């Protein structure tokens, strides 16, 4: 709603695995301000693959060890692993070259979920000399 989303969050591109082929795959995953999540097959989002909520949708998200039923792909390690669930009831598998980006999804998306934004009247005001 609120005529769409304006501003991202994140982008970068994370490991998702599969399901009728079981294998992890490139996909590029941006946040937007609405507290919304799309991910796109690549940074261009020109064919928009689905869209899930953020805001007060992520019931949990596991990272590392934390992962149950998920395995790291080719060359990647278990420090890497992350799943995020849905207040809907389905997950998103997805997997973090290294635990560093892992924890950054986890803890952007975390607080999307339950932090709500000014979104409504703001100004790119800024430096000027400089």
């Known amino acids: 709603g609120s005529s769409g989303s304006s501003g991202l969050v994140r982008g970068g591109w994370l490991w998702r695995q599969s399901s009728i082929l079981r294998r992890w795959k490139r996909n590029w995953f941006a946040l937007w301000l609405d507290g919304t999540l799309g991910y796109y097959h690549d940074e261009t989002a020109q064919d928009e693959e689905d869209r899930v909520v953020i805001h007060f949708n992520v019931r949990d998200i596991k990272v590392g060890?934390?992962?149950?039923?998920?395995?790291?792909?080719?060359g990647r390690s278990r420090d890497g692993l992350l799943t995020v669930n849905?207040?809907?009831?389905?997950?998103?598998?997805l997997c973090a070259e290294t635990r560093d980006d892992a924890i950054a999804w986890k803890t952007a998306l975390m607080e999307a979920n339950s932090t709500p934004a000014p979104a409504g009247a703001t100004?790119?005001?800024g430096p000027s000399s400089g």
């Open 65 to 74: 060890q934390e992962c149950q039923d998920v395995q790291p792909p080719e």
């Open 86 to 93: 849905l207040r809907e009831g389905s997950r998103l598998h």
């Open 123 to 125: 100004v790119p005001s």
